[PDB]
Amino acid sequence: ACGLVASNLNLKPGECLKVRGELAPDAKSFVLNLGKDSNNLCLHFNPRFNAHGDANTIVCNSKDDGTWGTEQRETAFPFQPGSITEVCITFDQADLTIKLPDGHEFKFPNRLNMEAINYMAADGDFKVKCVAFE
Amino acid sequence: ACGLVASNLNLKPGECLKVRGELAPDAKSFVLNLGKDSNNLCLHFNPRFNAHGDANTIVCNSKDDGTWGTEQRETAFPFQPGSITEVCITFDQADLTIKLPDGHEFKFPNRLNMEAINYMAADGDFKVKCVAFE
Numbered sequence: 001a002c003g004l005v006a007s008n009l010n011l012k013p014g015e016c017l018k019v020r021g022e023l024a025p026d027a028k029s030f031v032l033n034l035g036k037d038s039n040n041l042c043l044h045f046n047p048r049f050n051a052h053g054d055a056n057t058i059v060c061n062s063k064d065d066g067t068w069g070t071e072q073r074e075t076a077f078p079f080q081p082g083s084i085t086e087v088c089i090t091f092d093q094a095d096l097t098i099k100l101p102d103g104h105e106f107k108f109p110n111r112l113n114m115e116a117i118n119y120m121a122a123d124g125d126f127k128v129k130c131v132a133f134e
Numbered sequence: 135a136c137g138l139v140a141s142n143l144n145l146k147p148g149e150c151l152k153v154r155g156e157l158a159p160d161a162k163s164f165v166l167n168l169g170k171d172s173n174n175l176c177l178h179f180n181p182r183f184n185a186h187g188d189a190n191t192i193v194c195n196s197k198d199d200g201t202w203g204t205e206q207r208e209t210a211f212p213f214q215p216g217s218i219t220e221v222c223i224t225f226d227q228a229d230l231t232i233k234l235p236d237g238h239e240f241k242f243p244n245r246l247n248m249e250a251i252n253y254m255a256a257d258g259d260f261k262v263k264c265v266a267f268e
């Protein structure tokens with residue numbers, strides 16, 4: 001965990017969290033983590049260019065008290081190394097919604113029944129350049 | 135309670151940190167802290183509408199291992215309760231430079247000789263809406 005870590009986010013349901021940043025020239029993997037704290041994540045958002053046996057695949061998971069849940073994978077991969085990218089995230093009682101920069105959108109279940117998101121962290125081959133709250 | 139806290143900022147000399155946010159309708163005081171950690175601050179930036187015996191005055195200080203340094207006060211006060219505001223900050227070996235939204239700029243000495251800013255925190259009657267790097 002070398003990237004930006006933010007706490008006291010107070011993101012509420014329906015409010016969009018917009019994260020923009022720079023993908024390394026030789027990016028292999030990058031991560032955006034959201035939740036209560038570092039061991040309790042409603043969203044581990046992990047686009048893998050080539051990491052852990054996945055190629056050009058977004059892997060999402062939850063983390064409950066340090067234990068990873070069951071993974072969800074997405075096919076579309078709107079990212080390129082050496083480029084800027086932007087992701088928007090919101091949530092409700094049921095799911096998190098991830099808005100991808102190619103205009104694609106997908107859902108990830110709110111397994112931990114989180115009513116507020118207080119923690120974000122960036123990791124991997126990504127440097128945050130802008131974080132915005134609606 | 136404290137607003138947004140961010141660590142692993144990796145702000146280098148000459149790089150600009152842009153913070154935009156909402157001032158409470160009845161704002162009395164707000165704070166932006168920058169430095170290494172919560173006890174070691176190269177910049178405590180505290181516009182006071184009416185707090186601690188100051189009226190409409192920006193109070194700046196450093197904090198070295200929990201101890202406040204010698205205060206610096208600025209006359210101009212380009213802030214209004216209930217409005218959005220934006221501050222931009224950079225630094226070099228000698229000083230921090232604070233760029234105010236009325237176009238004013240002033241300097242605060244880099245007393246702790248910080249070569250990198252790792253930590254930021256918002257506090258008081260201010261809700262961060264956007265943080266951007268540089």
Ligand SMILES: OC[C@H]1O[C@@H](O[C@H]2[C@H](O)[C@@H](O)[C@@H](O)O[C@@H]2CO)[C@H](O)[C@@H](O)[C@H]1O
Binds near residue numbers: 044046060068071
């Ligand atoms: O689930 C998120 C974590 O996945 C870990 O890798 C998994 C991998 O995705 C899976 O296919 C299998 O190989 O088991 C691995 C367990 O280590 C990553 O190591 C971790 O960083 C998270 O992304």
Ligand SMILES: OC[C@H]1O[C@@H](O[C@H]2[C@H](O)[C@@H](O)[C@@H](O)O[C@@H]2CO)[C@H](O)[C@@H](O)[C@H]1O
Binds near residue numbers: 187202205
């Ligand atoms: O120096 C920053 C801190 O100031 C504290 O208040 C000062 C006040 O500004 C000064 O005029 C004198 O009265 O001593 C006070 C206590 O040190 C604030 O309480 C603190 O929050 C910082 O802003």
